[PDB]
What we know:
The structure holds 7 chains of a larger assembly. Chain A has helices at residues 91-96, 98-121, 133-136, 151-163, 176-183, 226-229; strands spanning 36-39, 44-54, 58-60, 70-79, 81-90, 138-139, 171-174, 204-205, 208-212, 220-224, 230-234, 236-243, 254-263, 265-267, 273-277.
Amino acid sequence: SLGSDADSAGSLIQPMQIPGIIMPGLRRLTIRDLLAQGRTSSNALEYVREEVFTNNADVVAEKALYPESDITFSKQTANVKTIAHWVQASRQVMDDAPMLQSYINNRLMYGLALKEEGQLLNGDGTGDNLEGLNKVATAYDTSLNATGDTRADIIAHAIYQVTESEFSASGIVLNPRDWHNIALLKDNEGRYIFGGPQAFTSNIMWGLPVVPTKAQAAGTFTVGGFDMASQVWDRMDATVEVSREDRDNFVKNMLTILCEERLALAHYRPTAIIKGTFSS
Amino acid sequence: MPGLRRLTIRDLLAQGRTSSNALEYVREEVFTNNADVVAEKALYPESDITFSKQTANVKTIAHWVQASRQVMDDAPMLQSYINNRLMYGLALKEEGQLLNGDGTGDNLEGLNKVATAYDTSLNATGDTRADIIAHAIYQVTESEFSASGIVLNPRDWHNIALLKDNEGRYIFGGPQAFTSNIMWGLPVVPTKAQAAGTFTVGGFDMASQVWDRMDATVEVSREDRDNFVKNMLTILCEERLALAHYRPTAIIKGTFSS
Amino acid sequence: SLGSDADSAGSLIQPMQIPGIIMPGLRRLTIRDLLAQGRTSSNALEYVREEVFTNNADVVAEKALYPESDITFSKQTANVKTIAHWVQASRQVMDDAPMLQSYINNRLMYGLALKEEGQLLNGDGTGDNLEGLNKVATAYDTSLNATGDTRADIIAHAIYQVTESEFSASGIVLNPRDWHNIALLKDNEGRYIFGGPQAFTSNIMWGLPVVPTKAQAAGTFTVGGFDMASQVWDRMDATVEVSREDRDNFVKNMLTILCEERLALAHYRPTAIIKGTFSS
Amino acid sequence: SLGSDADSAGSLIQPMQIPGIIMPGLRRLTIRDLLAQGRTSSNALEYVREEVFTNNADVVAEKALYPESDITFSKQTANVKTIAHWVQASRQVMDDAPMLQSYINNRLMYGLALKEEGQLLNGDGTGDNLEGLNKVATAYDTSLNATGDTRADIIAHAIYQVTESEFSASGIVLNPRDWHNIALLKDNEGRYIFGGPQAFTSNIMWGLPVVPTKAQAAGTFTVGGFDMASQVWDRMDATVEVSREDRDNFVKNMLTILCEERLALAHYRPTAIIKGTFSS
Amino acid sequence: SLGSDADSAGSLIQPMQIPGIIMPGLRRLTIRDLLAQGRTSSNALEYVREEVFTNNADVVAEKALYPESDITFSKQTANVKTIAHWVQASRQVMDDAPMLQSYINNRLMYGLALKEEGQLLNGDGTGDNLEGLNKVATAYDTSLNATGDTRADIIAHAIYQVTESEFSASGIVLNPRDWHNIALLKDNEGRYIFGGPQAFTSNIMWGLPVVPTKAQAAGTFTVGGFDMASQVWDRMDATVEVSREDRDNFVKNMLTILCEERLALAHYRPTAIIKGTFSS
Amino acid sequence: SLGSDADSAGSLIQPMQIPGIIMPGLRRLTIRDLLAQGRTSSNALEYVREEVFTNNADVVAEKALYPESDITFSKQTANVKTIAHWVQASRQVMDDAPMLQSYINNRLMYGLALKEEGQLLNGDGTGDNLEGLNKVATAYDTSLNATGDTRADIIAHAIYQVTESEFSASGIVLNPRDWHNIALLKDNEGRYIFGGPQAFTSNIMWGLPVVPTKAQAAGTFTVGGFDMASQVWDRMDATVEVSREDRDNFVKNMLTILCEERLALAHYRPTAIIKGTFSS
Amino acid sequence: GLRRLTIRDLLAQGRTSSNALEYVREEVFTNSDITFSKQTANVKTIAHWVQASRQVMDDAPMLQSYINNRLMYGLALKEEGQLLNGDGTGDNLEGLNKVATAYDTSLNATGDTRADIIAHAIYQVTESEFSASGIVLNPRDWHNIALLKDNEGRYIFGGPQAFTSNIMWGLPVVPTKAQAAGTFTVGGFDMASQVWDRMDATVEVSREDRDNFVKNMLTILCEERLALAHYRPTAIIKGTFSS
Lengths: 280, 258, 280, 280, 280, 280, 243
């Protein structure tokens, strides 16, 4: 009998290829689009912020000596760092896969922009590592915690701590898993606070937009007025340049694709940022 | 005239028509992302990528019945009925594979087979059955994709839409009204195919696609084997399918602890 | 003294007559309106219903033996039964009272059609009786019950068991006293479940029409796809024919009135019908 | 000193007369306005109701005898009773008080019209006394009362009992006090069933009009389709006449004021009326 | 050193005067504006009310003697009382502070009008004291208080008792403090009955306007149809006169100020007014 | 390797200067904008308020002795005080940083105005300190506390205390932290009083606006009709003068900047302002 | 094809467009009330396959003409094989020996022969209020009948000169091989039980049935579906040869 196995027939019917490739899960970048964008052209940035304001204004009695108040200033600096990575491949492949080139670019960008968001959130500040939000951010005041408070109360408590800097909040950042267990909070009767199975609710909390990014650690969180509390300064937009002559690539018939970018983070009002830790 | 109902699964996935023996597609396997911070005049990080040629074969499903040609030609009304029964019966098994496909031999790679295991550590103390399904919807997000639908054993879904709070009220609408087939804004399809006690969730809308080679068609034959001699009639109902799994990470399978 | 007493002049005044006749509560006709209506011209018609479907459809390889599926069919016979009753009356009264017969006629239809429903529901199926729905219907799955269930919870379960026959549930049948009690249901907090204490909810439950007929025995319920499952076949419509000449009627100057009809109940799918008993 | 005391100068001035007599609470006339009103000119009314319909419709056997059904007719009667009363007074006072007569008239009418309701409700039926509703009304079925039922739950049951007779219930009657205690029911939660303290609830219950009248004794209720269950026939509308020459009146120089009214209460369908006692 | 001390030169600058006297709070007069008003010019008022109406109206048999009914009336009086007070001051303060009498005049009118309510409400009725409302008000029916009743639950009962008179209530008067503890009531869950903390509740209860007045003793309350319950008659509006020659005022160069008013309260229908006291 | 460390070549790139200075959190002032304002020209204010009104207007019998009523007036004074502070800086720095001057001026104002608010509330009222709103405010009635009351109940209770002067409360003042916990109040079921987490809660309570200010010490609160309870008087607006010859400034090359303001607070009706403390 | 006598021709021939039909029949007797018995009559089918080589079939067009007729006859032979003897299953039919009335032996006389006993069976046709029609026997038995003589050696039917065909006592005779040796049946068929034809005797060929283009074996099938209706079981009588 004429089957379809390699043994007999079947070596004629070629499987119809599916146009293009299957790109994996693309994390929704948001952190960048949260802070103010800046366009620099130098190596570093120097700014000045009022450090200590010793106010002694008081009720001075008649014909007496007035109070002497003092003020302090500091020069906080923000250095420019660089993020990038390269991937060398065979030119033999590139010539056969036309759309491969334009693809790899769409990847390295995501791959880079990912670590971009990664640093921004938790920058060590150690040497080359940037100084992320969860580094400078003022710690959550444990005093605000009361008897029997849901994880939701804590967040609300945080939003307040922001107001202690006379500045209004802009958004809330959490680990998707944590935010999940929150949307499922139930009252003493049974009903859901946000949900109610028949339909699902949006990512809003106390009028403030919620942003659940996997970049955030499981247990930690952040709240503040990002759209005015800090600014990201771009030196060089994410560019992708290719080289056919890179070192011994000419002799090996290979292209060395590169994707670089120069950034710099600035922390104006650190008092408007809060980093806490969920207890359980 | 016999009527049917909704509750479709084939409609839940991407439907495309083919005309070949199989489908060759490529997917990004292991992406070695090493992008990081780099000191001045230092050597940059090297990253790499991996690909695979995942193939999905075109299998065939069908069945037949041998009846008396006499009863058929004398009462042609029964003809159309029998046909519609097989069409319905086959379609039931169409889902049979899609859900629990052995993946081995001739059985297709069922969703449950390819599905990523449910996270056991998510179930908290004092959770209901709905709380679980909810957890699953999140598991999908771990793939960076929006969940599309939900599939469960009819008996299970039944005892679910009937849950009540401490006050006593019904969660999915009071008895005065009907109980819509939706959860958290997501459609739901209860089928016997799904085993009692198990469940499935994912972004079927674009996580996996079904490829139809030959639509379910029924054709009869007067002549065949015995037939002519035993004045029999062989009715056949066939359908050539092929299932492909693009993003397996976007599908979960678990079990209730009740 | 001249009074209105029968002894005195009270024999002169005649009480004012009131037209028409006070016809007792006319029950609302249902059931028959739920089933499919068909007409015949025979004494009976043998139908066939799908007994056992043996599905065996499975995947197969090339040069493979296709699977065989079997479907068992139960041959059932639908008999045409006859219902009626006669009334012997004085032909003298008929002449003295015009629209009397016009009344008696429209009175027997109700009397007859009453048993019409009385059979279709609780048909004994014993010889001269009809194979009633409850007699045919499959029993309720006592296993579907769960701790804490209410009366409503049960009916809900039934609607599901209908789906097991691969058929859409049509309506619900109950004894008024039961249905009434059901509507007046309360939660663990207090308030009513249907409409409220100010509005009596309509006859709709779980999105399906509810039919309360005294015909349905108390503590018994029936559910299914009536508008598609079983069909009723009419041989002779409800007709009334009278005759002065008959037995000794002509001699006693009597007139016997007759009202009859010929029905036939079909059951294409019992699985799609459930009957259970309310536990108290 | 001169004071307003009688023993002083007080007897000089006179108090300012206040035009108008102080009529007590004019009880809101109801019931009659509810019941279907008619009009006759005789002294009695006769109607006919189907007493007993002996239905025997059943399935028929092969070549056998048929069922014999029978019916009963009763000539229920309703007499025309007379209600009235008279007041006797001095013809002297009448001339010294113009508006007096015009007042008495407006009183006797209300006085008579009051006893009118009084009969329609609790009519002894004792010969002369009219056959009140509560007399003919079908007793409430006790076996309908469930466990843990509110006073409202009962009335709800009552409604149905009318439907058990195949009729349109339309109207509720009870002692104002009872209605009050009812409209103030609270759930195990606390909230008021018929609207919070914000506003007083309307006299609507279960989509049915509510009529709280003092006529109805405490712990007694009535339900039905009064707008069709019974009809009141008027023979003599309430009129007022006076005679100065009546017997003694002339010589005693008096005057007699008369106020008569010939009524007749008909009870077509008693089955459509219910009366019960409250479980206190 | 030349400061503003007393021992220094500070005793030169005179502080800026603030024209206008600081008149304390003014209790919003209400009572008087509630009930109907009018005026007379005599010493008392004699109105006529229907005392007893023996309605013996009943059913009468033919050729029988109709029932005899009788009526009764009683002339009720209403005495005109006087209320006032005087203030004695020196003319030395008057000529030196012109804008004084102009003040006191507009202060005594208030002072008097204040005690005006004091009588209208808790009117003793003994001796020359005016017969207030609470005194004449029909007692409260304690036989209405059920088990587990709220304070507002009681007031509701009162409103009903107005129907006992066959009239409609048009107001509810209570001590502000009591009313406060009422509006702040909550169910067995916590939710406020009169509205969530967001917005304050209006002075409405059971569709009837609420009137909080300090004139009402704490724990006491009143309900009725004032606009048709009782009318106030004025003999002389609030007047203010002064005398320098009053008694020994001349030989003391003092001045006596008077502020009198002649009132008279009449209670037409007392049955439509209820007074009571809270349990706690 | 020609890098940009510092010793290599980093000494060539000058950091991009960030225009302007980062000013800390700017506390939104409120208190001052709550009271009526008006300028003066003296150094003290005198007002006269009716202390005790001994009213005795009672009912008087005919030809009797009228009641004597007395009145009292007090001369309450209000002193003006001065608040300020100075800053000593190098004349060199000034000439090197232009905008500095304009900044300091704009910073001293806020610095001063801060204590302005700080005094108006917690004014010791002792030696030179102004008689702050709290020091004057009538103490809260401990008797207005019901069983199981939340902080939310108390605030409402306070509003009533204001009504004990016949005035309306203009607003509510308290420490932000305290108000925070209040906004997060839950009922016995566990739900939120002001708003579900999905939504945001406004800053109003019982129709009255709420004003949170750090100035208010934690655990304290104030309520009343401020708009006309007290008035602020400005002798001299907040101005800023500068001297280059202050003391030894011409020898040390220093420049002294001063920011002063002459304020005077008056308290008309104290009985319309309440202060209290939470006992949680 | 001149044929002989067909048992099929002995019954009234009608037509139908159904799969069956409910009839009515008599059973018990009394004279003057009678009794009945009512039931249905189902339609079955008859035929037989003929596996032959297409090779020779196309070598002669006029060949299939004969092949066809050879089957048309074999069809009738199998037809009469079940008409007399039928189980009553979905394949078989309700046979005559099932709806027959055994011979009343008491109608015998002393000094009778085989020729007398068959005429005795004719009288039993009278006790059904009907007339006689046909006679059926085994060819071998009938052969003995025609060759019968008396004690002296003389024929009954007469010499060879006197002879028409298959008749006896003015009634037709159909000696079929279907009737067992020593068995016989009689009745008034022309008016007793009749037959209705749904589909006439039509043949339909197939180049497909298991082995066709596998061996060039084209199988021919001569089919026909009819229906036998029984009205009077008393008008039928079956017996045996006692000697």
